[PDB]
Design a binder for this molecule. Structure first.
Ligand code: HEC
Ligand code: HEC
Ligand code: HEC
Ligand code: HEC
Ligand code: HEC
Ligand code: HEC
Ligand code: HEC
Ligand code: HEC
Ligand code: HEC
Ligand code: HEC
Ligand code: HEC
Ligand code: HEC
Ligand code: HEC
Ligand code: HEC
Ligand SMILES: [Ca+2]
Ligand SMILES: [Ca+2]
Ligand SMILES: [Cl-]
Ligand SMILES: [Cl-]
Ligand SMILES: [Cl-]
Ligand SMILES: [Co+2]
Ligand SMILES: [Co+2]
Ligand SMILES: [Co+2]
Ligand SMILES: [Co+2]
Ligand SMILES: [Co+2]
Ligand code: NA
Ligand code: NA
Ligand code: NA
Lengths: 519, 519, 258
């Protein structure tokens, strides 16, 4: 049973926390709810931490006073198909194995499921840790509350005696590295320097042994990722987001200068031994586009290569923790700005980008974004109660489960069936274009070995490799992006038609050169 | 508010209309409901039209007295998947892009949806007008009543200043021509000479600028397509149907001479300046096989080529507005009769037919057709009311939505689940054969470049091109036809097995010749 | 139907012309609701000649207004039918004490759907001594049949007499001609304002109700709320016009402005 501490004693040293805490809606909430600092208080100085206090990072620490939000946060949507592979005629990318080749995603790329599972799913997917981590039982796949309480309560390490990345099962990969975890958990928020730079005060960095880092982490999407625990104010904590918006001055809405003045991030920096260590970004308004955009964006969180000379770019380089902060039509220029590509296609030899869930950068410029709508309006609205305080739901999911709040409050002349039909019209149209982009891209790729074997020149092959970069970018954006065009149907349509145009041009060039060489 | 005209004054000149109007169930319905003829009456002579009277062609003109039928006609089935591409593992023809090659259908071929949308969908599909016409908002896709009231209330032209067919978006085609519109609308019924021949009195013809024609049209599947507006009697208006049944003497049921004597079309011809101009075909009984067969048939409505010498066949030629009026086993002979094929396959170089929704010609000879069943019995029955006049529904759709009326009234020993299971048994079986026909046809097609590049002789390639014609015909009939075999399961089975047999023969010949040439 | 020359009709019917030519029925020919061939052959402006027929079935309107007609004939099965109110399950459990020997004590059921109103008036135990009865207890569901005509679904137990009397032991003969004005207006051209005796009226307040009943067929005729000539909204019920106009009370007697 908790005993409150003398907050004034803490404030004597912790003046920034004092300024945040005394002024906001947690002014009456005592430190003991989230910190055990008895030995710390006995041993600290103005400058030395002394004994490190415990910080309780479980979402359950908030549940004593916010049970409603915590229960919603831990909830599971069983209708979100679990562990469903995308390289599959029943899913998003039937030809993915041809198109992605030997990239790590070829070992497994499933569709997303409920937020409660995010850290568990990161740990156990076949592409991440060589199959090292596994659910303790296949019964455990249902346990959202268990996952929230801690990954290691439901999964286990197949070899606690070693820390190396290796394969435990034949068809797995070891693609995980420490940067990944920033979009799964912030349990390490006090143990990771801004951007993951090596730092005297950081136990973990981009260059850490990822198996050891994994074992130190527990909880998914911590509540304090979107709310400052001291002031309650809305914020973001994700380093690479703050870097793009603030350090690089690109703004919260990089395509809209006025909106970027209306929605702002105010950086706060915390130090260790008088040296800058970590940052947060305080929001002036609770804009969920920025909160959700901590994770639902295209990023680098992985080694790659330089476009200029092909040299490896490893985890020591800041480019391996980067938000591109660009729409699909600006992405190629943004990747050139950092002189970077992800992988060389195993079949075609083309340098290629690897794209991931660019929801926010797709949403920019869309009709709903232009009308001031945000992610949470459609995916995470308030509950509706005849006789209750209407809190915000806290496990985002498709608007199909909540159409009256998500759509019909604005679109008041539609029935639920009509609004869903409008969704399906866009998704069906967009999916059809994705299928055709895959047909043409796979056709181009399958012709590369024919061309090489027929003696087609390097000049022709290099021309088509350059087309492959763009054919790939303007296809993969849309298999990566989870709305199947709904977030921006006109952009999806223009981009996918560009992918097809490029692949058709590449097929034509290869067929002509093969026929000439023959022969 | 309408004021009635003196009909006797009209009849003085319009003696055929008098004979039709005074005798039928519209004898009390005044001309002013459907015509504004004040200046016409002031200026006409026995032979000159003078000022052209207005003819109201909106289905809503009928709604003053037939609201029930009009409301049903405008209704939308949201469960009919909209804008769903067929070249897709989730739809009818997963390998369509290989099989159809560079044909215009490769730019987009969606599944059908509710009748209300037919003219809109024609205008906006990616293969038709280069993307020139577009819904004004993606919200508008739900608006069936809006579409019925006029296409241009819900879609717009991206460049009203020009009339040429061109691409506005990269992956579109300009396959539309004026003949298409005859199966979408009959707003042009007084502006189009029989067969679309150029004619002094016709504003529009097969050779018209299709973008200009499009702008003059508004409403889908006009009510008077199946009902004479003057007499109320059942009729057809589609020129190419009347041409096959009457002018060419093939009969309403070309495979059944006795049934063709029982169900008849009586032509009525109307003149302009003493010259034959347009025709309708009066039905002796309200046989919906003929009414629905105005559109749900295999046709030419497009340029093509001569089988004999390969010469282009353009819109000036009557062959571009033609009903083949033949079952799948007679089709090759029927296309030879007019010396015609649609396209040369881009990969194989084979002349090929292009098939479209041959529902009526598939239905002929089937068990239900032989038992006197018609399309409307399963797709457009009467409403069921405990205490009301039971009118006919007017938006045809799957019998799954109305199983008691569509099936179980006859099949009185089945439950709804049993009747649906019998449908699914046939569709599953037929779909499996379509998949195998695609596998074998795609396999044959993919071997053509290997054979050409290995130096296989033109004699062998020409043998396999002739097999390709039949392999294609006996596959595509079944992806074109929308019942997935239900309308004629034994015919679907024989035809698809023939497609497979032909493709297997072609693969064998190509493999043997490649091996010999090599090794 | 073959249309008549309405201009000819207008030569002797200016009051109807003025209503017909200006409204939304201007194009609707007289033949939909009147058979007047012998009338035209024999009339002068000062002599009716043969009385023309006027069709009063709601089904006369269904040729052009099927949607409204179908809804008009519909039956709400959830409205409990033939449920007596003097009953612990209904509105007035002590009704038999309170009303005593009044005719309503023989039977007073809750209302049900409009389609049945004339039928129900004819067959209730308090109205005609049980003289009129459904032809079968199956017929109670038939809303459309009732709309098409009461006598298609009910029958008279003694067509040979016209007196009000009891046919069943616990019935009453409370009906009189005034009742029918709230059940039907098939009699609209045969009933003078207020039901006064009148040379031109075959029926009146003082008529033999059994004979009057046999001349009536359809419930709540469509033209009770809509003028058939102009389409404009109207009332036809004499007592309501008498309250608003003759008694000088106005349409809303508690609100002068309204
Ligand atoms: C009880 C001892 C609490 C603990 C533990 C947590 N919170 Fe809290 N919170 C508490 C109170 C009394 C209030 C003010 C309520 C009021 O309006 O009177 C709050 C408020 C918040 C808010 C603010 C919402 C708003 O109105 O602006 C947020 C976002 C919030 N609390 C978040 C939060 C988090 C994430 C917690 C775990 C780290 C947490 N709270 C714990 C009381 C208590
Ligand atoms: C990083 C910590 C994240 C934040 C912040 C947000 N999301 Fe998220 N989301 C994230 C992951 C890693 C996943 C997949 C989890 C798994 O185990 O597979 C998701 C998933 C979703 C989904 C799909 C849910 C489903 O039913 O399938 C949605 C609809 C979604 N996310 C939306 C969303 C919103 C609206 C956010 C801001 C309120 C948000 N997410 C933040 C990672 C992270
Ligand atoms: C009693 C006769 C059982 C029946 C019927 C079903 N299950 Fe079962 N299951 C049972 C036991 C005792 C266990 C082991 C539990 C443990 O101590 O670990 C299980 C296990 C499972 C699992 C996990 C399997 C694994 O990890 O190897 C799953 C996914 C599971 N059970 C599901 C399941 C389903 C869906 C059932 C209905 C078809 C079912 N079980 C029946 C006992 C019994
Ligand atoms: C924020 C910019 C992220 C980074 C860094 C990583 N992931 Fe991620 N992940 C993110 C989101 C928003 C989602 C849900 C949306 C989606 O398209 O899946 C996910 C999902 C996953 C999943 C579940 C789905 C799957 O691919 O199987 C896994 C297993 C996963 N993420 C693993 C993973 C790895 C190994 C990472 C570093 C290489 C990584 N994630 C980083 C957001 C972000
Ligand atoms: C970003 C992806 C979030 C995470 C992680 C958590 N919350 Fe949240 N919270 C979020 C939004 C977009 C909102 C609505 C803000 C608005 O003004 O519209 C909220 C709101 C709250 C509140 C306020 C009361 C309410 O509206 O429900 C509280 C007390 C709160 N959130 C608590 C909370 C808890 C306990 C969390 C971990 C279980 C948590 N939030 C995570 C966004 C996000
Ligand atoms: C208010 C905050 C809204 C929410 C919630 C939803 N929609 Fe919306 N939508 C809104 C506006 C103001 C508009 C523009 C209307 C106009 O004047 O043109 C739209 C537009 C759409 C569209 C058309 C998009 C386009 O053509 O670019 C669609 C298909 C649409 N809306 C659907 C839709 C759905 C299904 C929603 C629930 C997920 C939804 N909207 C929510 C306002 C708001
Ligand atoms: C009222 C002024 C009408 C207009 C406008 C339209 N129709 Fe009509 N129709 C009308 C009547 C009074 C009747 C006779 C009804 C009866 O049986 O007494 C009809 C009949 C038809 C039918 C006949 C069905 C049959 O019983 O054989 C058809 C097929 C029909 N009407 C079609 C139709 C069309 C297509 C209209 C718009 C062009 C149209 N009608 C207008 C009255 C009126
Ligand atoms: C030409 C004017 C047509 C006539 C006459 C008939 N049909 Fe039709 N039908 C036509 C088109 C162009 C379409 C596709 C419309 C679109 O926008 O996609 C259709 C569609 C159908 C369907 C599918 C409806 C659905 O829910 O998906 C059916 C079941 C159908 N058509 C049947 C049918 C019947 C039975 C007809 C005679 C009563 C009939 N159609 C006539 C074109 C035309
Ligand atoms: C009558 C013989 C037709 C001719 C001439 C044209 N179409 Fe058609 N169309 C017809 C039917 C019966 C249907 C529904 C059945 C089906 O298989 O689709 C259609 C459907 C369409 C559609 C919607 C479905 C799709 O293919 O995307 C479109 C866009 C369409 N039709 C366009 C179109 C064009 C461009 C035509 C001239 C080249 C044309 N149609 C002619 C019947 C008939
Ligand atoms: C052919 C594809 C049709 C179109 C276009 C329209 N109607 Fe129709 N109608 C059609 C059939 C097959 C039938 C049933 C005929 C039979 O005897 O079984 C009908 C019937 C009517 C009627 C008669 C009353 C009824 O059965 O509902 C009317 C008044 C009628 N149709 C009107 C009408 C209207 C107003 C239309 C445009 C909105 C319309 N029809 C188009 C076939 C077809
Ligand atoms: C066809 C020959 C009709 C007959 C028989 C009846 N009505 Fe009618 N009505 C008819 C038309 C063409 C119209 C105009 C429709 C329009 O869209 O404007 C009407 C209109 C009415 C109205 C509405 C007037 C308004 O203010 O909107 C009413 C109330 C009406 N009709 C009533 C009615 C009655 C009660 C009938 C039987 C006595 C009747 N109509 C017959 C066509 C025809
Ligand atoms: C006299 C011609 C009437 C007119 C005008 C209206 N109503 Fe009526 N109503 C009337 C009777 C005689 C009955 C009982 C019929 C029977 O057979 O029992 C009714 C009944 C109703 C009801 C109850 C319906 C049910 O489901 O039980 C309602 C709700 C009702 N009436 C309402 C109503 C309205 C709103 C009217 C103007 C539009 C109206 N009535 C006119 C007699 C007459
Ligand atoms: C066949 C074996 C029957 C069974 C089972 C049920 N009914 Fe019947 N019923 C049947 C006949 C041949 C008749 C007489 C029809 C005639 O020619 O008049 C009836 C009559 C009724 C009646 C009217 C009774 C009367 O007026 O005396 C009613 C109300 C009725 N039936 C209802 C009914 C119910 C509700 C049934 C299931 C409990 C039922 N019947 C079964 C034939 C048969
Ligand atoms: C209009 C002022 C009416 C007069 C005159 C008569 N009735 Fe009536 N009746 C009227 C209404 C609005 C209703 C429904 C509302 C209700 O409270 O019932 C009725 C209902 C009936 C019924 C069915 C219910 C019942 O009492 O059993 C019957 C059998 C009936 N009315 C008979 C009846 C008789 C015999 C009348 C003259 C003595 C009479 N009604 C006049 C409206 C009016
Ligand atoms: Ca990336
Ligand atoms: Ca064809
Ligand atoms: Cl844990
Ligand atoms: Cl229009
Ligand atoms: Cl009767
Ligand atoms: Co799925
Ligand atoms: Co993904
Ligand atoms: Co589908
Ligand atoms: Co089709
Ligand atoms: Co009751
Ligand atoms: Na559930
Ligand atoms: Na619906
Ligand atoms: Na009912």
């Amino acid at each position: 049973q908790l005993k409150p501490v003398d907050a004034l004693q803490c404030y004597d040293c912790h003046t920034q926390i004092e300024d945040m805490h005394v002024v906001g809606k947690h002014a009456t909430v005592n430190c003991v709810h989230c910190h055990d600092a008895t030995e710390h208080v006995e041993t600290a100085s103005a400058r030395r931490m002394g004994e490190r206090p415990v910080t309780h990072t479980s979402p359950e620490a908030c549940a004593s006073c916010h049970t409603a939000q915590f229960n919603s946060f831990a909830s599971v949507r069983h209708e979100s198909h679990p562990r469903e592979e995308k390289a599959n005629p029943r899913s998003r990318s039937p030809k993915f194995d041809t198109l992605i080749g030997a990239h790590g995603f070829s070992l497994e790329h499933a569709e997303p499921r409920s937020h409660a599972f995010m850290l568990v799913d990161h740990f156990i997917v076949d592409r991440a840790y060589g199959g090292r981590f596994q659910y303790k039982s296949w019964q455990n796949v249902t346990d959202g509350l268990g996952a929230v309480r801690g990954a290691w309560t439901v999964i286990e390490d197949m070899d606690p005696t070693t820390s190396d990345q290796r394969r435990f099962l034949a068809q797995t990969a070891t693609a995980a590295n420490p940067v990944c975890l920033n979009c799964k958990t912030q349990d390490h928020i006090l143990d990771w320097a801004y951007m993951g730079d090596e730092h005297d005060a950081a136990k973990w960095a981009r260059t850490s042994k990822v198996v050891d880092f994994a074992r130190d982490l527990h909880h998914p999407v911590n509540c304090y990722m979107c709310h400052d625990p001291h002031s309650t104010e809305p914020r973001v904590v994700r380093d690479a987001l703050i870097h793009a918006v603030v350090d690089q001055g690109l703004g919260t809405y990089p395509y809209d200068e006025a909106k970027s003045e209306h929605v702002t991030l105010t950086p706060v920096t915390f130090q260790r031994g008088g040296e800058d260590f970590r940052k947060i970004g305080l929001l002036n308004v609770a804009d969920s586009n920025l909160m959700c955009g901590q994770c639902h964006v295209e990023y680098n969180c992985n080694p790659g290569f330089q476009q200029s000379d092909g040299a490896p770019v490893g985890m020591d380089d800041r480019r391996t923790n980067h938000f591109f902060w660009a729409n699909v039509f600006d992405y190629a220029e943004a990747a050139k700005e950092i002189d970077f590509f992800d992988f060389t296609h195993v079949t075609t030899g083309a340098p290629l980008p690897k794209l991931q869930h660019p929801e926010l950068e797709t949403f920019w410029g869309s009709t709903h974004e232009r009308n001031g709508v945000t992610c949470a309006d459609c995916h995470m609205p308030r509950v509706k109660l005849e006789n209750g305080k209407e809190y915000t739901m806290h496990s985002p999911r498709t608007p199909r489960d909540m159409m009256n709040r998500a759509c019909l409050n604005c679109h008041d002349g539609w029935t639920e069936a009509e609004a869903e039909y409008a969704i399906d019209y866009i998704k069906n149209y967009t999916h059809g274009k994705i299928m055709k982009a895959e047909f043409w891209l796979a056709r181009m790729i399958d012709l590369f070995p024919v061309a090489k074997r027929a003696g087609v020149s390097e000049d022709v092959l290099n021309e088509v490799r350059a087309l492959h970069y763009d054919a790939h970018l303007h296809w993969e954006w849309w298999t990566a992006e989870n709305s199947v065009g709904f977030h921006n149907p006109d952009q999806a349509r223009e981009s996918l038609m560009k992918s097809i145009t490029k692949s058709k041009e590449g097929v034509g060039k290869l067929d002509a050169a093969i026929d000439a060489a023959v022969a």
